[PDB]
């Protein structure tokens, strides 16, 4: 859906921006500094779930650019693993939110954050 | 969820970028230049539906900036109307996609585009 490589870059960057907002906005809730409304979190994690599936199709052949390291394409299996671990952690987070269970939410949120960071470290410039 | 006004601006801009991709990518399909896969479109409009609900909360009090005209806040009812018409057209588009009906899809897509443009003209700089 990306006329030029740059269009894929702008796409993925915007997806990550939104992912970051939907993830990061729950930190004061996971930390206890903002109140916990299970339905609010259930709805928010649904948004985050949708968003979290979006970037991957925007790392197609020939879409090198932005802060994407070239190893994303030369180590495609390793990047596929980091991405699939991440989305798998998203499934666990949806399950926790869907349960309305704050401890399971805190643990799932921590795992998701870790997978964000793991890819950050390997595959962002 | 926006520490500073600028954070709301970056949020909404990213939502619109993604909306634009998910809307605009269907043009060759609505035009007949790319093939029509009803399930592909059903899934895509589900994404667009999620995305299309996102910008509005990022035009909160005190988030003036970007290409947002100040009339968005001084004419809050008029902007609320343009936004609600738009999202209502999104519901019609979801119904068409969910039906797998290409003519209803083409008409719904046209109405959505028009609502995009109507707000563009009034409320973007
Ligand atoms: C888990 C929820 C997250 C969060 C919160 C973020 N990421 Fe990543 N990200 C990845 C790559 C390759 C990039 C560079 C993209 C490019 O420039 O082409 C990024 C970028 C970001 C950003 C910055 C976006 C921008 O405005 O430019 C942010 C805020 C961000 N990410 C947050 C790669 C990955 C992963 C690879 C498997 C995973 C997993 C994540 N990111 C997860 C997250
Ligand atoms: C219908 C599906 C659409 C599409 C495809 C787009 N819009 Fe709008 N949009 C609105 C406002 C006030 C802005 C300015 C935001 C800001 O800068 O603070 C925008 C911006 C855009 C963009 C540019 C995003 C960027 O990268 O900076 C794009 C690509 C875009 N829009 C497309 C306002 C509205 C509406 C008010 C009710 C409605 C409806 C729409 N936009 C709808 C759409
Ligand atoms: O929670 C997160 O951890 C990483 C980053 O902080 C690692 O440096 C990231 O992208 C997040 O949003
Ligand atoms: O389909 C669209 O119409 C408007 C714009 O072209 C009006 O100038 C817009 O934002 C779209 O994505």
Numbering used by the authors:
A (entry chain A), B (entry chain A): 1 to 125
Task: Quote the authors verbatim.
Cytochromes c′ occur in methanotrophic, denitrifying and photosynthetic bacteria and have proposed roles in protection against nitrosative stress, NO trafficking during denitrification or pathogen defence. All cytochromes c′ have a 4 α-helix bundle structure containing a heme centre with a solvent exposed proximal His ligand and a buried hydrophobic distal pocket with a non-coordinated residue (Leu or Phe, rarely Met or Tyr) in a position to exert steric influence on the binding of diatomic gases. Unusually, cytochromes c′ are able to utilize both heme faces (distal and proximal) as a means of discriminating NO from other diatomic gases. In order to understand the factors controlling distal versus proximal NO coordination, we have examined NO binding to AXCP variants in which the occluding distal residue Leu16 is replaced with residues that are smaller (Ala, Val), of comparable size (Ile) or larger (Phe).
Kinetic data confirm that this variant has a high degree of distal steric constraint that destabilizes distal heme–NO binding (vide infra).
